């Protein structure tokens, strides 16, 4: 118990690492089809694909709250997982160690825009990022969203063909 | 303070009222212990089984 | 034996000689309620300082008598709160003039 | 990076009329720079930069918005 | 206006997630307080629904004085009939709202 | 697994219990030295795959005068002409060499150090006393093990710690827990200890993909591809590491993940599907 | 000074009633009533008042009242007529195996120069400071006391540096690892020293943290772990067997760790509390106890400190990495002005800093668990 | 099962003059601390300690 | 009991639903609909579900720089004829994305328009076919 004399909560450090709704019938995370603010932010071992020429193919989270509404206001902190292999530089020279930055392309979740309309992806998607927020990929092979768009993912629009 | 020290030997030095009353207690739990203990080994009914 | 109106808190201990019968020169009861609960501070007389807290008793040990006290009036030494002293040793340290020398 | 964050600014004062915001002055990749204006976006790399992402070939390349393009399996 | 009955509820729908008073900060004494009671403000189950609830603030979109309608870009938490009571906001952000 | 630091690198068995020793044997130098002084022969235990890595570089330093005898494990596993070499180079020193089996270590090792000391171990001023041995190795390489054995031998019988070997000639092993643990590694020492399976892998500190690439890097320099890939039964010789697993997995089934099929070549190169050795000497 | 030996009561006493180097003050008509500290005071000008109380309370120094014992008495005892007052003498300090009171030697010693840079930089390291204590941010890579080899900064050189309108400089009150870096406490006074010594026993109630980077996730997040450690002198170095039993030549190490966050199984981030003072007790428990050495710790995580997974922001085999173990919020007996104790922090250091932001974390931040 | 609370589960010795009340005078001496003193018929009265 | 949940207030207590007749709500959201109509931010529709189902949509989203066109399905229209409580489902499906997205009528700036006059059953079910695989693959 800490403090003696008056216990507190530990998890004091992870309570402003991540953004939590009070579950009361005022308050709920909704399922992301009914408006703008509803949902629910991935946790941290979620797993998503990373669309990219990187070696890397999965990427588990380190974000305790990753979504589209704040992904200029946050940085995504990722582990690559399950890594692909070649037959034969940097790009290619990605390991199932390593730890990148991420940028959102898409949700599977239902994503609400504050214009009424609603989208549903088929994949969770990312991209790889050094820590300059620059793209270690040469290109993508998916299609970004509108909050990729910000001038905090620049070089990932710069990439990114096709937007939604 | 002890009860009697001139009878700690016998009375643990805690009054015998009060250890009636622990006793009690304790037995009675002891009682219910041994009542599930008999039905467990004997198939959940002590004179039956 | 009164309201706050009618008698001051350092008051109350006015039974017992030494300074706790000359009115404390620092008071923190107006302003916030402080986490220790110090209400009232006398002047340093010497490295001491007393306070007094408005709380039922802190269950300290003096370093002079050795003794747990329970009581509101604590001498601190120096400033340092590790080192209380009881209302009683206080006063004895003062009338011998050890205040510095404890 | 010198150079590219002087034409860089170049280029926004050459946009100056209808330019709505600067670029960093604190240039975070040393190796490329991107100026947005309008519907147009200078791309200013070095020469290794610029061989080993090859852009240029791939919007080249690419093959023009097809209707029809649509009409396959999906991926 | 009436915000929309929901009768009886319990804690996690009301009140739903699923200040010291005297401790000792350092080990030189030991002086507590104890909590003997329930103090006055406690999240608790109770009748959660009808009751007088006030926006604050909400802009007006649109105003139809044919049919006498007045649209607010919001959503309230009241049933279809309620007699709502409109105001004049008389400030906001530091000014006044007519000027 | 998931858990970075290895106990193994650390950890023995004392009379107490266990212990966490610390440091480098540079350390420990001095404290091997007297116990070596206060002993009557050395009993080194060594594994034969990588025999100058097991072995404490210290008391080869210091040590030379006192009769030695070292017991090379795994020695089926090990190189037979690096065996031979340095089997010469200690029959020149005034050390002995004997290389074992598993059983061979299991008992012959107690066979032999009966024969030695009865040989060429002289003969005490008295009879009721003991010549007695220091035991110098790795807990993992098996050193551990037959302490433990003769433990268990001399408390059935019986209903610092030295342990009794047989009545005659009165022999009794003196252990030493922690003076020859590897505690902190360099990588490459760290990788071949991985992979002659005294050290689990993990994770984190160091992954089965490091091992299993380094165990295809030094087999490459070898330039022993093409037998690899007839003893891993693989169809044909592979090219690069990644090519290797994908062929390991293809051959285990169509579901091979790939850290299920990287698995594989360690237990392989533990279990002495291929012969090899990592480990240097002078002359 | 040397040969002094550990004596007993039994022996103290026996040695105090053989030595004959003593002085008998006999207390005639115009000392009767003066008090015992005031006769000291005027019979030894050169000795302190510290001294003549030490002496007096420990005993040195008595009376002899005919009474066939020896009176030991309080410094506000009055004498009496007639009676001796038994003092020792210098042979009796040095010319037995009894030691002195630690202030009544007259030992001296000289000083050291100071550059100005090397003074502005202490300034700047200075966080706290009040009346009587100190604490100042002691960097990474700097010692504490003085290395083998003597041409070599530390703390303990540069502590004339904030020896702020004072005439004696300040005492370090506990020292820290020449890798670990966060605060330090300085008492500005010998009384305010002795008094916050007893902070840094051993204590039930942790008062500081440690705010570390460790490789690898302990299985859990919080709890408590105990080893006890025998350190023992070796080659050049020192050996530190650790072992989860006590044992007679052993020493307790108790530290009570929470991870705050952890990124995934690759890395997280703990807080230590300790209970207890040891050679290294944080970087072993968390090496060895934990399983998770420390991002910076070669000493103990060789070649696993250092790990390939932080490979985009810290290079593998820049082995110059600076551990990422830091004190803070330093808890001290001093009060402020609402009452409640003073916590001094710390800010973390450039490498630790780096780590947190790369990985999303906020750096300023209080941690409630020490008020 | 027998008791589960205690408060001294030895016992105490039936002396209470001394430590040594049961012994004789004669095979056990007394003790002179001020206590017993005060009781003793011989070492409360008069006390001689001055000394020449 | 220091505070109070409920409201016994006549003024709250109070409804309208008896008095609602006196206000035509359809004939004001259809107002509603037709000048949304007049502005052009929506066309008149009177479909149903069997005539719309699998009808390609072209959507043209003004967002910037470059608008966003896309080409899919209708998996579903929420109601039969012009009003504003509309929405339109569609399937699009670019190189390589498959978006699921619901439409509201009426946005200036999402400017949906079913391309054919007509749909076919058998398109609309291998189109829900292949929705359906790229779901469950992902
Ligand atoms: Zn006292």
Redesign the interface.
Known sequence: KLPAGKPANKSWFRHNLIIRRKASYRSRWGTGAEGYGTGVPFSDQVKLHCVDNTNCKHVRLISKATAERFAHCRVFPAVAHRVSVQRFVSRHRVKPGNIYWVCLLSRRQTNTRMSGLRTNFDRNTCILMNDQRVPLGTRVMYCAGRHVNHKYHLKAVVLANFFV | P??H??T??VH???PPR??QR??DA?TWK?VCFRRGLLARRKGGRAKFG | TGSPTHQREYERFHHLPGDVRTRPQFDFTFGETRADRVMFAWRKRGDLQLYQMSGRGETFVCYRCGYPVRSQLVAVKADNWDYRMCYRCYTNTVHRGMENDT | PRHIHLAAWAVQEADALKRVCKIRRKQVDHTWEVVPVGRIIVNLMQESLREELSLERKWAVTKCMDPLSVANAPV | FQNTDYGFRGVMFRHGFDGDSRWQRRPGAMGTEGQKRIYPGHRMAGQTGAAAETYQGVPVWRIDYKNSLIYLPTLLDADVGTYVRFSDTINTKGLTLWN | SRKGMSREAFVDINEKGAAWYLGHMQLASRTLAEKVKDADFVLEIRDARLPFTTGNPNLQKIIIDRPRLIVFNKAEMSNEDCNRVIQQYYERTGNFALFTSAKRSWRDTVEAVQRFVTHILPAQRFKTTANVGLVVGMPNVGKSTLINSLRLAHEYQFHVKLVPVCKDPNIVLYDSPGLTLPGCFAKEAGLKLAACGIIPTNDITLPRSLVARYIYDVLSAAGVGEHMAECLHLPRAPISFDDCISMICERSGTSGQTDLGNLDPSRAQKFLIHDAQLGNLGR | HARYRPLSLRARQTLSEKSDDLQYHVVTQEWFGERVDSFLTCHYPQWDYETIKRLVQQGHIYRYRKNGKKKFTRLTDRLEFDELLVVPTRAFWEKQLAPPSGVLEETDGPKFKLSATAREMAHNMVLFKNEHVIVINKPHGLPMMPTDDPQEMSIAAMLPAWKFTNVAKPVVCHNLDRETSGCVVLARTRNAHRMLGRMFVKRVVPNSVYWSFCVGKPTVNYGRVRMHFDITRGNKGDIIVARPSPTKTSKVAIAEFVVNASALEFGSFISFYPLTTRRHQERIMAAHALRCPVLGDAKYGGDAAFPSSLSLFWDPENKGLPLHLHHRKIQLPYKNTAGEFICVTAPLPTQMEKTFKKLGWPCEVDDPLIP | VPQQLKAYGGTFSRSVGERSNHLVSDVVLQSLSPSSTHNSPLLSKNIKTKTV | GYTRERTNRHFFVARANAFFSRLPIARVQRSLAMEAVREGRMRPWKYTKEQILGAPVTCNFEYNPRPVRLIGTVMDAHTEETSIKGGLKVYARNEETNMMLWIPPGNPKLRHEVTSTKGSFQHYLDERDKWDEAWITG
């Open positions: 002890l009860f020290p001139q700690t030997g643990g030095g805690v009060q250890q622990v006793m304790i002891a």
